[PDB]
C-alpha cells in the first residue's frame, strides 16, 4: 500500500475490501451511490452484501480482479492491480 | 430493487454483459476518432494483444 508494505492478499481480490479509491493511472474512482455522468447499473440497493461503500475499488461481480468506475470523461472504468498470493 | 436484493445474481450477470458490451464499445469509440489506427497497420494488434 505505502512505500514500505508487503501485505499478503488471498489471490483474486474478489473477497478483498481495501480503502483504495484511486487507480494505478492516477485516476480518481467514482462513488458507488453517487450518480455521476458515467451511468452505472450496479445499484448498491441490489448489492448490500457486497460492501459497496464510498468510492473504494472492489470486486462486485466476482471478476478476474477488482475494478472501479472513474470520474474521468475518457475512462468509464478500469481494473485494479493488487498483489496476489504466491504461497 | 431498493430495499430487497432478490434476484441479484441474475441482475448482476446481466450487468456483466452490459459492461462487456460497453467496454468493448469503447474500443470502437476510440477507433471512431482515428480509423487509420483502428483498421490499417499496427495499433489494433498492439492495443488488443491478449487478455484471455
Curated annotation (Swiss-Prot), chain B:
Tell me what this protein is called.
Plasminogen-binding group A streptococcal M-like protein PAM
Q: Which organism is it from?
A: Streptococcus pyogenes
Q: Where is this region: 2 X approximate tandem repeats, type a?
A: 9-34
Q: Where are the A- repeats?
A: 9-21, 22-34
Q: Where is this region: Able to bind plasminogen?
A: 3-31
Q: Which family does it belong to?
A: Belongs to the M protein family.
Q: What else is known?
A: PAM has more than one binding site for plasminogen; it is thought that each of the a-repeats can bind one plasminogen molecule.
Instruction: Give the compositionally biased regions (Basic and acidic residues).
Output: 13-51
Gene name linked to the record: pam
Give the UniProt subcellular location, in the record's own words. Secreted, Cell wall
What the protein does? Binds to human plasminogen (and plasmin) via its kringle repeats. Also binds to albumin, immunoglobulin G and fibrinogen. Could provide the bacteria with a mechanism for invasion, as streptococcal-bound plasmin could permit tissue penetration.
Amino acid at each position: 500500500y505505502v512505500e514500505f508494505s508487503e501485505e499478503c492478499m488471498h489471490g483474486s481480490g474478489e473477497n478483498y475490501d481495501g480503502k483504495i479509491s484511486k487507480t494505478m493511472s492516477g485516476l480518481e474512482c467514482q462513488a458507488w451511490d453517487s450518480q455521476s455522468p458515467h451511468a452505472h447499473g450496479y445499484i448498491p440497493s441490489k448489492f448490500p452484501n457486497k460492501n459497496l461503500k464510498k468510492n473504494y475499488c472492489r470486486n462486485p461481480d466476482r471478476d478476474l480482479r477488482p475494478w472501479c468506475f472513474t470520474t474521468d470523461p475518457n475512462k468509464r472504468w478500469e481494473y485494479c492491480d493488487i498483489p496476489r498470493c504466491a504461497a | 430493487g431498493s430495499v430487497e436484493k432478490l434476484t441479484a445474481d441474475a441482475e448482476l450477470q446481466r450487468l456483466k454483459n452490459e459492461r462487456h458490451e460497453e467496454a468493448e464499445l469503447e474500443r470502437l469509440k476510440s477507433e471512431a476518432a482515428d480509423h487509420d489506427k483502428k483498421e490499417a497497420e499496427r495499433k489494433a494488434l498492439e492495443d488488443k494483444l491478449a487478455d484471455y
